[PDB]
C-alpha cells in the first residue's frame, strides 16, 4: 500500500510544483510590466500592504516588550543590563523581525490573496477575463505578486523599528536603564550594514515565497466554496513551513 | 470622526457580548461529555492530529535556529556548554507556547472557522435546530473542548522536538559534548515551575484561540465571501490576542 500511495503523492507533488513554476513564469514575462499598471499596483499595495499594517505595528510593539523583559531578566545577572538595546536590536534584525513579519503577513495578507483569487475564480471572473482577450496572469497575478514583494520588506522595516521602540519602553522607561547607555551601546557596537542587509535579504526571500505560495493556492483552488476554505488553510500552513525552513537555511548561510 | 466612532464602539461591545453569550450557552451543561465521546474523538482528530505535522516540522526548524543563534553568541564567552539551558528555557518560556499558538491559529484556528461558517452557509445549523438538537451543545462544545485539550499537547510536542533540534545543532553538528549539554540543561533550569508556566500559558492561549475561532465561524455572514473575511479575521485577531496575552503572562510569571 505504501509504494503506490507514496508514488502517487510524489507524482502529485511534482505536478503541483510544475504548475506553480509555469504560473509564475507566465505571469512574470511582459513588456508593459509596470507602465499602465500604476492604479492596479497601487490598489494592490493598499489591499496587501496598508491593510496589513496595524497587525504588524501592534505585534512589533508586543514582541519588543516581551524581548525587553526576557532580555533584562537574563542580563541583570551579569550587570550587563545596558546591553539590552543591543540584544533587542540584534534579535529583531536577525531572526524575530523577518520571520514573525513573514508569519503574520502570510496569515493576514497571504490568506486574503488566496481567498480573493479563489473567489475570483469561483464566480468565473477569470474565465470571463480570458474570454475578452485579457491575459489574467498578466492582469491579476502580476500586480498582486509585485505588491506582495514590494510590501513585505517595508512591513518588516516597520516591525523592526517598532519592536526596538517597544524594547526601549520596557528597558529604559520601566526597568530604569540609562537611556544614553541603551541607545549608545546599541547603535555604536552592533548595528552595521551587514546586520541590516541580511534582514532585508531574508525579508525579500520570505516575500517572494509567501506571496508565490499564496497566489498559486488561490489560482489552483477548486472553485467550490469548500475548496477555497481548504486552500486558505493550505496557504497558511505551507507558507509558515516554507518561511521557517528558508529561515533556518538563510541563518546557516549568512551567520554560521 | 465621532459620528462613526461611537457606532463602531457599540458594535464592538455588541460583538463581545455575542461572543460571551455563545461561550456561556455552549459550555453550561451536565450531560456534556458522556454520549459525546464519538464527537470529541473526531474533533481531536480534526483539530489535533491533522495539525501535528506542521507542529513537528516547525519545532525541528525553530530548535535548529535557536541552536545556531545561541551557539554564535555563547561561543564568545566560552559558555557554549550552556546552549542546552538556553534552548530549553527559550522554548519553555516564550517561543514554545507562542509559536505553537500562532501555528495552531493558522492551521487549526482557521479550519474551525471555515468549517463552521460553511456549516452555517449550507444551513446545517438551522436544519439541526429544526429537529430539536441545540447546535451550541452539539457542534460548538465538542470543537471547543477539542481545541482546549489539543493545544497544550501540541505545545509539549513542539517543545520536546525543538529541544531535540537544538541538540542536533549543538551536540552533533557544532561538536559540544553531549554530557555537558544535557547535564547542564537539566539541573540548572528545568524546574517544575517553568514547565507549569509553559502549560498555563499554553492553556490560556488554547482557550482564547479556539474561542475566537469558533465565534468568528459562528458569527460570519453565510455568503462565500463573508466566510473568507472571517477566516482572515480569525487569524489576525488570534495572533494579536496571543501576543498580547503572552506579554501579560510574561510580565506576571517572570517579575
Amino acid at each position: 500500500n505504501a509504494l503506490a500511495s507514496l508514488g502517487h503523492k510524489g507524482i502529485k507533488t511534482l505536478r503541483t510544483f510544475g504548475r506553480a513554476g509555469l504560473m509564475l513564469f507566465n505571469a512574470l514575462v511582459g513588456k508593459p510590466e509596470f507602465r499602465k499598471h500604476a492604479p492596479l499596483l497601487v490598489r494592490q499595495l493598499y489591499n496587501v500592504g496598508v491593510l496589513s499594517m496595524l497587525i504588524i505595528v501592534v505585534s512589533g510593539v508586543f514582541i519588543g516588550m516581551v524581548l525587553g523583559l526576557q532580555g533584562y531578566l537574563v542580563l541583570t545577572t551579569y550587570s550587563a543590563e545596558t546591553s539590552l538595546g543591543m540584544l533587542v536590536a540584534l534579535s529583531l534584525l536577525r531572526e524575530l523581525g523577518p520571520v514573525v513579519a513573514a508569519l503574520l503577513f502570510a496569515g493576514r495578507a497571504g490568506s486574503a490573496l488566496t481567498a480573493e483569487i479563489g473567489l475570483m475564480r469561483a464566480t468565473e471572473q477569470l474565465s470571463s477575463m480570458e474570454m475578452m482577450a485579457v491575459d489574467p496572469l498578466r492582469r491579476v497575478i502580476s500586480p498582486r505578486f509585485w505588491a506582495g514583494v514590494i510590501s513585505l520588506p517595508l512591513l518588516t522595516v516597520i516591525f523592526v523599528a517598532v519592536g526596538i521602540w517597544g524594547g526601549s519602553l520596557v528597558g529604559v522607561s520601566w526597568k530604569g536603564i540609562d537611556s544614553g547607555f541603551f541607545w549608545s551601546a546599541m547603535q555604536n557596537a552592533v548595528d552595521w550594514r551587514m546586520d541590516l542587509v541580511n534582514c532585508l535579504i531574508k525579508s525579500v526571500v520570505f516575500a517572494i515565497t509567501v506571496t508565490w505560495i499564496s497566489l498559486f493556492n488561490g489560482y489552483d483552488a477548486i472553485p467550490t466554496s469548500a475548496g477555497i476554505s481548504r486552500a486558505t488553510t493550505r496557504t497558511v500552513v505551507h507558507s509558515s513551513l516554507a518561511v521557517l525552513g528558508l529561515d533556518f537555511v538563510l541563518t546557516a548561510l549568512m551567520f554560521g | 470622526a465621532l459620528a462613526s466612532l461611537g457606532h463602531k464602539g457599540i458594535k464592538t461591545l455588541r460583538t463581545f457580548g455575542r461572543a460571551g453569550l455563545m461561550l456561556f450557552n455552549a459550555l453550561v451543561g451536565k450531560p456534556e461529555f458522556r454520549k459525546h465521546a464519538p464527537l470529541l474523538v473526531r474533533q481531536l482528530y480534526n483539530v489535533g492530529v491533522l495539525s501535528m505535522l506542521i507542529i513537528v516540522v516547525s519545532g525541528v526548524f525553530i530548535g535548529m535556529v535557536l541552536g545556531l543563534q545561541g551557539y554564535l553568541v555563547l561561543t564568545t564567552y566560552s559558555a557554549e556548554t550552556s546552549l542546552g539551558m538556553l534552548v530549553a528555557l527559550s522554548l519553555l518560556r516564550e517561543l514554545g507556547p507562542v509559536v505553537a499558538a500562532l501555528l495552531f491559529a493558522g492551521r487549526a484556528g482557521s479550519a474551525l472557522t471555515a468549517e463552521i461558517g460553511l456549516m452555517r452557509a449550507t444551513e446545517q445549523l438551522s436544519s439541526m435546530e429544526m429537529m430539536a438538537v441545540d447546535p451550541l451543545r452539539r457542534v460548538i462544545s465538542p470543537r471547543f473542548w477539542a481545541g482546549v485539550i489539543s493545544l497544550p499537547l501540541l505545545t509539549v510536542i513542539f517543545v520536546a522536538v525543538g529541544i531535540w533540534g537544538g541538540s542536533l545543532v549543538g551536540v552533533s553538528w557544532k561538536g559540544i559534548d553531549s554530557g555537558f549539554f544535557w547535564s547542564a540543561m537539566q539541573n540548572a533550569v528545568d524546574w517544575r515551575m517553568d514547565l507549569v508556566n509553559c502549560l498555563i500559558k499554553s492553556v490560556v492561549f488554547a482557550i482564547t484561540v479556539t474561542w475566537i475561532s469558533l465565534f468568528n465561524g459562528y458569527d460570519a455572514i453565510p455568503t462565500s465571501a463573508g466566510i473568507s473575511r472571517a477566516t482572515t479575521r480569525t487569524v489576525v485577531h488570534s495572533s494579536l490576542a496571543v501576543l498580547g496575552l503572552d506579554f501579560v503572562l510574561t510580565a506576571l510569571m517572570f517579575g
Partner: peptide, 27 residues
C-alpha cells in the same frame, strides 16, 4: 501503478541518501 510505485521507491531511496548525506556532517 508500476511506474508510480517505481517513482515512490526511488523517492524513498533519495530520502535515505539525503539522510546519509546529512549524516556526513556529523554522526
Amino acid at each position: 501503478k508500476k511506474n508510480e510505485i517505481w517513482v515512490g521507491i526511488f523517492l524513498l531511496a533519495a530520502l535515505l541518501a539525503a539522510l546519509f548525506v546529512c549524516l556526513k556532517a556529523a554522526n
